Write a protein that binds this ligand. Structure first.
Ligand SMILES: Nc1ncnc2c1ncn2[C@@H]1O[C@H](COP(=O)(O)OP(=O)(O)OP(=O)(O)O)[C@@H](O)[C@H]1O
Length: 254
């Protein structure tokens, strides 16, 4: 039954199983095909690949915005469609390369999707992890300032830093980062991934790091190289450099 599941215990074991996909406005153009992998909790899994390989598409399918045209997208061995949409939203947090923040305050941006009301100490905490706290404080009303009443247009890094704070404060089981730290400062890029890798609270949570930046991908527990809508190969940084294929060619080229 659709939208019937909302378990007390959520592990966060994501699996794509022989997943194929095409957008419904272009069904005769294959984007994904034979896509199979498992994202384990307690691991930061990197998803790297060239332009048009279908990384953002995989992120869209994992958020349950689209159904796969073939195969299955499983969460704890159960199709995403069977999970309640709000429950899924409370357990899974997704952050894009260009996050939409307009129409609310910075507080409301960070406290987005939460049932409970977080304290300032909670809000500042997650904002300082993403490097959002200092420039937000620079605005007239701080976190209470509306997006658009800041004085000037926010940079892509600044929007990402806020959208990352939203993801962190929710305490999700599945964290999806679709180039979510691309415009961020080089230090803040690694500070965020250090938290996700080293901290004990994320040691029981699943993290999907989609990125084309090699310095980010090499620090993941596990790397998935996407090519032609499917996984070319996978393993650790040093494992892929051992034999030589899709990943090694990219490292040597760049
Ligand atoms: N809404 C859409 N409608 C139709 N086609 C789309 C849509 N979104 C993406 N595509 C197409 O699907 C393919 C995969 O797109 P996707 O953005 O997932 O690749 P990507 O690896 O994320 O690329 P990049 O890393 O450059 O963003 C592309 O060829 C793109 O043109």
């Amino acid at each position: 039954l659709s939208g019937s599941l909302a378990p007390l215990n959520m592990k966060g074991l994501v699996k794509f199983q022989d997943v194929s996909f095409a957008y419904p406005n272009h069904p005769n153009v294959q984007v994904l095909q034979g896509l199979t992998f498992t994202l384990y909790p307690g691991k930061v899994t990197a998803l790297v690949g060239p332009n048009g390989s279908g990384k953002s598409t995989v992120a869209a399918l994992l958020q349950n915005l689209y159904q796969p045209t073939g195969g299955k997208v499983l969460l704890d061995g159960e199709p995403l469609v069977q999970y309640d949409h709000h429950y899924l939203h409370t357990q899974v947090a997704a952050v894009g390369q260009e996050p939409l923040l307009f129409g609310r305050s910075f507080r409301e941006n960070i406290a987005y999707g939460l049932t409970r009301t977080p304290t300032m100490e909670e809000i500042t905490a997650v904002a300082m992890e993403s490097g959002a706290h200092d420039f937000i404080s620079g605005f007239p009303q701080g976190y209470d300032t509306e997006v658009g009443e800041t004085g000037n247009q926010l940079a892509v890094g600044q929007r990402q830093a806020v959208a990352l704070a939203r993801a962190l404060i929710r305490k999700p089981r599945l964290l999806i980062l679709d180039n979510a730290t691309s415009a961020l400062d080089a230090g803040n890029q690694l500070r965020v991934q250090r938290l996700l890798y080293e901290s004990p609270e994320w040691a029981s949570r699943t993290v999907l790091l989609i990125t084309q930046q090699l310095s980010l991908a090499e620090r993941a527990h596990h790397i998935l190289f996407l090519k032609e809508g499917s996984v070319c190969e996978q393993g650790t940084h040093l494992q892929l450099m051992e034999r030589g294929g899709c990943y090694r060619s990219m490292v040597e080229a760049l």
